[PDB]
Every structure is written in C-alpha cells, then in structure tokens.
Amino acid sequence: TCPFYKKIPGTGFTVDAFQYGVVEGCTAYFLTHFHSDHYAGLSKHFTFPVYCSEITGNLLKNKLHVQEQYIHPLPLDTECIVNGVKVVLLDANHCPGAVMILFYLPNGTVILHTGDFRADPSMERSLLADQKVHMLYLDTTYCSPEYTFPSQQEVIRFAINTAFEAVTLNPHALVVCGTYSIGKEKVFLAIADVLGSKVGMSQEKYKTLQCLNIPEINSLITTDMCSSLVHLLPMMQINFKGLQSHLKKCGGKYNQILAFRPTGWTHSNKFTRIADVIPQTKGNISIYGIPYSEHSSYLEMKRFVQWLKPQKIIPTVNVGTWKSRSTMEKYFREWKLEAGY
Ligand code: NI
C-alpha cells in the first residue's frame, strides 16, 4: 500500500507510486525521473495515464515498452492543466529528464514536490520566485552537516586533468568509466572530449543514451569498442578482477587502464580535498573514486529551503527510522528560527 508522502491531497494524483498496484482514487500517476527506485512497477501492461518530462517519456517507451497512448509528456516552465488542476514541471538539476512538480490546488494551497534534486541558486529565478508554497515534499538524501562535497565543475576539472595527463604520458592507456543508471554523463563525455575520442559502450547502454536529447550525440558515442579509448562498463565490473578481464578483450591494443567510479558522498569526503584525491592501484590498473553528486549538499539544501520559506516540510528520503526523522525535524526548526519564517 501507497505511503502518505507519495500522495497529493485534494487531487487524484500520486508521485513515484508504481509499485503498489492500482492506487485507490488515483486518476494520474506522475513520474519525476527514470531511476529504478522511483519507476519500480511500470511495464508494457500499464494502462493508466503517466505524466512526465519528454526525456522520461522516451525512456518509458523504448526501455520499459509502455504503450504510447498512456505516455503524457509535458514541456518544462509552462503552466499545464491536468484533470482540472494547474501544474508546472521544473528542471530538478538531477539526471536527464528529472523534474520538480508545482501543484496549484483547487482550494488555493500551492505544493512543490522536488523529486530527487541538486538545489542551486539558479532555482531562485525560476517560476518559483512569484509565490508562496504551503507544502514542500523534499529530497532529504544528504540532510546532515557532515555531508559535504565539491561542485560538479571542480570534480569534472579533476577528472579531465587526470585522464589527459595519463594518456599523454602513455598513448597506450585505456580509460574506463563505471555506470549503473542514467545520470552523471558529463564524467565520460568530458573525458572523451579532451582525448579526441568517442565513448564506446554496449548496445543496451547506447539505446539508453539515444533517448536523452543530448545535442550532437551521434558525434559523441559508439558501439564500436575498438575505435574508442574511453569505454563504459557496468559499475560492478569496476574492480581489479573485472578490469583485468576487460583488458584481455582489447587484443593487445592497450597496456594500462585508468578507471573512474563516480560515487555519491563517501566518508573520505570528511578528510580529503578533491585536489588531494589518489587512486587504488594494482599493477597496470588504477581506480579513482570521484564524489560526483546529483543530490543537494547539506548547505545547498539549507539555502534553498531558507529562500523558499515553506509553511510545512515533508521529507521523502531517510524516513524509515525514528532517529533519522527526529534529526531532520531538528534541522528544519533551526533553519526556520535562523531565517525568521
Ligand atoms: Ni534519483
């Protein structure tokens, strides 16, 4: 059965609620983004209206085979009427196609559901500037002050410089990047661009990237692995055994691998600056863990919320333990006393 924080009161709507069968009273199911924890349940057999971005719609059609008649893509930044209720979709700064949803309820209440997001000051100049929000359904993934990490731009600078230096010293090195979902495509795109290479990958991953509306994509990716010196592999293969095994397949073209595992936050963020990061190395294989996040840092979250001044906050992440719930409520009250709302 569907939990409370996935329902939008005073509507027939749910958000990211596909794993509970038929939800009583639901006339439209919204999907914020194409990540498995959120789409869990959708398939070719789904017969209710799905509302989402264009990119999420391309993924539902091609990857999950949802029929065309049930996919309802909406443009961003545009007031739309769904089942008699005004909605807006906004860019969430998460993965490709990810949105926040603003709902203008019939009784005058305004609700923002962030989905998964990486808060940014640019959001203070969207359609949110205008107006009051009575309820915030908030992505609280990193809602504690120990969660620190650098800007995506600093992390990409480190990856480009690391890869460019290694391949310039050794023209016979291969670069490998781990993936297990959509998101974080800038990591492998930026490395391939500095090296003058296309990115090589499986047919399944290629299909996924072809759904993403990335400009000039045909110029950037390929299924011909042998033509490419940046390869993508599933994240589970990014270890010394999996990488050794991969090097055997390349027919004596390469004599070194440099590999990247983009992660979220890890405890080494508590101690080591991005500049000072070093790899794990065995023989001719080196593996870098790089902290490329598509969720808000504590400080980014706090700034967004103190700006928005919502009347009530409903967390959507870390809701399963009393200690997590209590900790998050304490921070919401500090923020509110500090800023005065
Ligand atoms: Ni996500």
From Swiss-Prot:
Record localization: Nucleus
Induction line: During mitosis. The mRNA encoding this protein contains an internal ribosome entry site (IRES) in its 5'-UTR. This 5'-UTR generally suppresses translation while specifically promoting expression during mitosis, when cap-dependent translation may be impaired.
Effect of H295A: Impaired nuclear focus formation, reduced interaction with PIAS and increased sensitivity to cisplatin
Tissues where this protein is expressed: Expressed in brain, heart, kidney, liver, pancreas, placenta and skeletal muscle.
Summary of the function given for this chain in its UniProt record: May be required for DNA interstrand cross-link repair. Also required for checkpoint mediated cell cycle arrest in early prophase in response to mitotic spindle poisons. Possesses beta-lactamase activity, catalyzing the hydrolysis of penicillin G and nitrocefin. Exhibits no activity towards other beta-lactam antibiotic classes including cephalosporins (cefotaxime) and carbapenems (imipenem).
Subunit structure: Binds constitutively to TP53BP1. Binds CDC27, which is itself a component of the anaphase promoting complex (APC). Binds PIAS1.
Family: Belongs to the DNA repair metallo-beta-lactamase (DRMBL) family.
Name of this chain's protein: DNA cross-link repair 1A protein
Species this protein is from: Homo sapiens
Name of the gene: DCLRE1A
Entire protein: shown range: 700 to 1040 of 1040
